[PDB]
């Protein structure tokens, strides 16, 4: 066949990935890269050929053909012809060298008479006239250009710096540590014609082809990494750099290889890897000639570790004295004299590693080190557009610089350049906005780094950008959003505060930029309420509908979720992260396109499932399966993450994504209860006419105001909390009563007299205010909170009691208030023990009143209590009783799992596919249903430390709909009710619970 | 302990047979009963009252005998006996 | 032994020395076994555990020997050296002497000299490696030592003086490991001692072939006299305890001089013939005096160098590489300078280097050594020239000779010659003091 | 050899339990009820003090210790002391 060898070369090679035929003749290869290389003699093939003689004259014809593209292109700049033009018709690897050639040639002239400035605008106009061509540039080419502009960019940068030199010795020095690319003009063997001079030492390029790769912008840390590379083989040395993960050793070596054209061969090491297969590969590469890098080789297994390291000394002390043979793998094998062993040096835990002892002699360690990022800033500006690129540079670092030593050592806080490549990332849809000025710099410092400050460090970043830069006083996109965010808020309830619109603000402008989006707050800070809030204003604004997926992360396993295949019949199921974006992906059936798709994780995040993510974080937006596939996301689907913490979370997936930190609550107090009480009201609409509904209303509004209650929450701190919960978040507990109180007794308002009703009102808002407060209090502190309840409410409204009741009539509509009453209880004898046996006391009743007055309200409730304080009895007594409600009972262990609950609810419960809501979990009886929970605070926590029973409980309460571990698909809870009991966590065996799961729970401490 | 049933033992499948063989022996015993709940309460009520678990832990003071003690399920629902050491009247 | 692996010590060595304490008279006796136990196992400790087991062997003699008024007085001057607490002793006239002469040292901010008076007061013949080897009873022996150095070269003048017969084996590749276990079976018969260079490196073959050979070897004894040497490395891989506890061990503890390090650079540049310039061979002893000042430095930290590095003769053999090629490269012109300083305190031996703060170091160093006209005065005592116009090379090699014949190194080298203040070896002085008064303080309390 | 490390099933043959019959004494090992010999003989062995033994073994066995220890030394250095003090009554 031949044309089936086209798979294998793009191992054997690096470079190249399939070859050209006219099936008689070879009439060249292409790289993996996409760019088309042909050669000169196109090679004849006969049927009985053999493979190892034909690709091996391929390998030398590939060489020439490089050399020729090269002498062809140079010879033409030579002849003064514009980079434009020689662009389109040389492949990228010539072009490069004969730029290289030319420049030095250039400047080696330039030294001497010291018309930098002549040359200077020369190279840089050659600059911008390869960046507006890039623009107007087919795809492939545009490659092409990309990687030439970094080459162009350095050549100016090492001109200009050569034009301030004080004195000529000064610009000698600065020559002297670049990499100069001679050509002998002399002499014959062409393929060893060009060499390359560094630090006094010279090194030959050899032609092998390197097709166009993605070629590192050359910092001056780029450079004395070369220099140290060139000085250890110069004297037959392997190269060898250590240090932190994420400095480039391994990239720098593949680069140091392309300068001199050489495609490097790199061994990612002990990422499970054969030493049968290295072994194989050491052979060749002493061979062939070639360069081989150990990447991060402190990650092998001692055995392994000690025979490749004996290898590797074979081969570097073959080099040293140069033996035409060496013994390794125990085997007589020829050492060619242009072989070259790199050594990459990861940390462990422990400090930076070092090299095995025999290899100590051998090799040369070097200390790789972040760049300095300034040189690295002022190239990105030269690309984007400059305007004036160095002063830009200076000042975004110095400003991120001066924020760092300025602003408070904050955990999630990045001001490494990480964050400001960020910036300039940000950058570039911004121009197309504003200009390549400091204004658009200026805005991008404020859309990136001004989201993720908070409030003590927010001034420090608006005091120090003006002290350093000062660009513009108007926004654009201010009024249009705004409008459309203000309309979306008052119909969905919200309050435009400071905070509200801020966080709102903060986060529309990066939706368009970031395609994940981190909000971190406390529980309850208002995030669910901005995305739901802006994201529901863009389609008022742009006309396009979202799909919004909120998905709890850590309730399902990564399994679940991102995709789990089964060891042995490697049978794949989809899972639910990968499920939802194959309605968009694999058939957009209906309408995906025009619309935009969300996918919200509300859990915690951790390390594990953002890992199984990284790749759309990445810059690639590709789903990587664990077996058979990657899938592209579309710019319509957004992931966005809220949570509560990051601690578990790696710097590195911070400033992949865009990260909004909500310092404070958005919302006031009173504006809070304002939209809960509206919330609370459309439930009522339902099932209470409007006339009924107008009248109660009116009531709650004049009965309770603010200026009384401030101080009443005020007074809520200076109190002991059992299972402590923040005032805030307490008030959902507050209204949602008050209202139901109300309603209750919306039949005896009809008649009753005007000034008896406001007091009826008055003691119920007291009572649902008090147990919304001090419920979770020791009662002894109850009792104390009453007086302050009663202090700072009206002193003529109707006081609070501590058992304070009002009674209606058995047989007749009545009103009067009495408190107190007990039934009298007789048990015989074998009634003594009995799971269920309660004898009523002034505070059973007390209890068992107000347990039941939340399950009205149907927020779910947590019975905190010492061992034996009933809380299970008066929980289960008040519900054995009543008709309405059933209980179903489900105790936790230290390691309880969802399904456990979920095969105890199955049990009284029944599925029902109703089109209403798709598929419900109504309870299989038609009266409502009880989960009683005991012992919520004893299932553990993942090592992270986030317990996913609890979350799921916390799914149910808030959602009121959960997701399908094996079928994947979203299920409505109809009717069914959460209630726990739990521990002080004070007490052993005790796990602290999630604010995030608390709030949603009313506290009765019993 | 905490309940009179492991879960885990008897789920899906495993769930269906438990409850199959359920109704064989309460029929057997002569009573049916109306519910799927009514059931499987017999079930637990019967390992409730017929399972008798005795620990005997030698040094309370091992980090993972403690850890028996430490278990709310056990410490409730267990009776704790002392028998530490033999007296000099016993030896 | 807990705290290095090197420091091993079996009953048998301890029963082996109390057997020669024979070939108040309990107490003579007592006096005789602290002495035999000072003087055979100070031998396989370093500078520092020997002044740890100095100060702790005094203190369990004087304590039981000596008066409970003894006992505080020292003990609170020990834990002035140490941080524990600061006191001047009890003092009775003519009450104690030779304590009243101790506490002299440390009232004197004087930190080496009252570590040692620990020593002199064993009255002990402290045994030169030579004596230890002479008395010692068995043909293996396994010498480790710090990075800095290497005893290497202590054993060919031990050879030399008694014996002859010196064989050093290179373990490299498996040519040196085959070649080497050939000229082990060979040597043994023979009778001629044998060395074995940096077996750390070489270790895995150990456990195989070495740890067997060595064990199965009890023919050696009956074997001709000989000797086998290994040289450790102690900061390194951990050696097989078993085979380390048979055969007998010593630390190297021996550090040269700036001025004798020099020296021993210098010497042996003329073994390499004539290639270059007369120039160069200026330039060759400016390297000479730069690495012999980095390597003083390396001890001394922190203060001096942050952490420890470790440079080599290859250190100095890929500079004067550069220096050979700058020169080649250039005109004699003495301007070439700027980059051979940029070069040399960067790649060369910067290299290592990761802590700014040292990197700053390093260079200032080139500032001082390279760039320099007509006078350089590398030492505040030595002053070197630049190459005179006569340029004869032979008579520049003897000039430069003659200027390191000339001079003698201070008494406070370490401060004078590297340019760093008197105040950080003082500082320095009292940090190695601290570390050995603790680990007796602690060492008295356990037992 | 290892006595550090213990499986529970042992257990029957360490304290001594047996089911008597005619002629054959059987002893429970984890499942299978296998005979005993009455030639057989159990020891075990350990290397490291380190290690720490079940307490339901180390109140069967009898723990015996073959170490040369610190304490050893002081014993031992008499023997020598007297060979080179008194040697006519380290003879006798």
Redesign the interface.
Known sequence: HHDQVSKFMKKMFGSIESIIFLEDFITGVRSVEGEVLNLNEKIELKDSIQAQEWLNILDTEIKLSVFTQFRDCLGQIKDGTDIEVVVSKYIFQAILLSAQVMWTELVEKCLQTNQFSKYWKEVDMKIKGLLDKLNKSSDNVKKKIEALLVEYLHFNNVIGQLKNCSTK??A??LW??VQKFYQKNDTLDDLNSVFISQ???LLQYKFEYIGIPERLIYTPLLL?GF??LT?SL??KYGGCFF?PAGTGKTETVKAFGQNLGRVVVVFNCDDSFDYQVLSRLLVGITQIGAWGCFDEFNRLDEKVL?AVS?NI??IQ?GLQVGKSHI?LLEEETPLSPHTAVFITLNPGYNG?SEL???L??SF????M?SPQSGTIAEMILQIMGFEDSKSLASKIVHFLELLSSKCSSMNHYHFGLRTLKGVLRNCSPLISEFGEGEKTVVESLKRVILPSLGDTDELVFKDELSKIFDSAGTPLNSKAIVQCLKDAGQRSGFSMSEEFLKKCMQFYYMQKTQQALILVGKAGCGKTATWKTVIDAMAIFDGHANVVYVIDTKVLTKESLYGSMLKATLEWRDGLFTSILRRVNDDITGTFKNSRIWVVFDSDLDPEYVEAMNSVLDDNKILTLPNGERLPIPPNFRILFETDNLDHTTPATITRCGLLWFSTDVCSISSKIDHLLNKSYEALDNKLSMFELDKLKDLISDSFDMASLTNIFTCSNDLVHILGVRTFNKLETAVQLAVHLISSYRQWFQNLDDKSLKDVITLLIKRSLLYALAGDSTGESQRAFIQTINTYFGHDSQELSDYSTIVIANDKLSFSSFCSEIPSVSLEAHEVMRPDIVIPTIDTIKHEKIFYDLLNSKRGIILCGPPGSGKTMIMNNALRNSSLYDVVGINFSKDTTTEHILSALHRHTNYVTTSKGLTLLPKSDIKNLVLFCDEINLPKLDKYGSQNVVLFLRQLMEKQGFWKTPENKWVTIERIHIVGACNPPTDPGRIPMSERFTRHAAILYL | LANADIPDLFQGEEYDKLLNNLRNKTRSLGLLLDTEQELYDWFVGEIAKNLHVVFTICDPTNNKSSAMISSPALFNRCIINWMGDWDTKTM | GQFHWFYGIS?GQ??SC??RV??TRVDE?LWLLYQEVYCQFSTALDKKFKMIMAMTMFCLYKFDIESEQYKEAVLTMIGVLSESSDGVPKLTVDTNNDLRYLWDYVTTKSYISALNWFKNEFFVDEWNIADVVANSDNNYFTMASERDVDGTFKLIELAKASKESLKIIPL???ENLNYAQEEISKSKIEGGWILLQ?I?????WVKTYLHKHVEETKAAEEHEKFKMFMTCHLT??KLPAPLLQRTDRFVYEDIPGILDTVKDLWGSQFFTGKISGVWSVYCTFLLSWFHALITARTRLVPHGFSKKYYF?D?DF??AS??LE??LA?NSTNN?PW??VR??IA???YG????EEKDLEVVAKLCAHVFCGSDNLQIVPGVRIPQPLLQQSEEEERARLTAILSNTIEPADSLSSWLQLPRESILNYERLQAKEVASSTEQLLQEM | QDGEFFDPIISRLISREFNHAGNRVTVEIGDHEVDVSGDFKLFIHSCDPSGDIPIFLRSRVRLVHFV?NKE??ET??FD??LT?ENAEMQRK
């Open positions: 010795e000064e000698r020095l002297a540590k630090s006094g030492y004395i220099a140290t000085d110069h004297q240090g000690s004996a000394q074979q002390n013994t930076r095995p002892e025999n100590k002699k040369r360690e070097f200390s080190k | 009953i301890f029963l109390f057997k024979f070939i006796i490299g590749s498996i940096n750390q490196m070489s270790l895995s390194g891989d080599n290859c053999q890929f590489v550069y090629n700058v490269t301007i700027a980059q940029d070069h960067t790649i060369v290299g290592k280097i990761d | 040369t050893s030394i031992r250095i020598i002391t080179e």
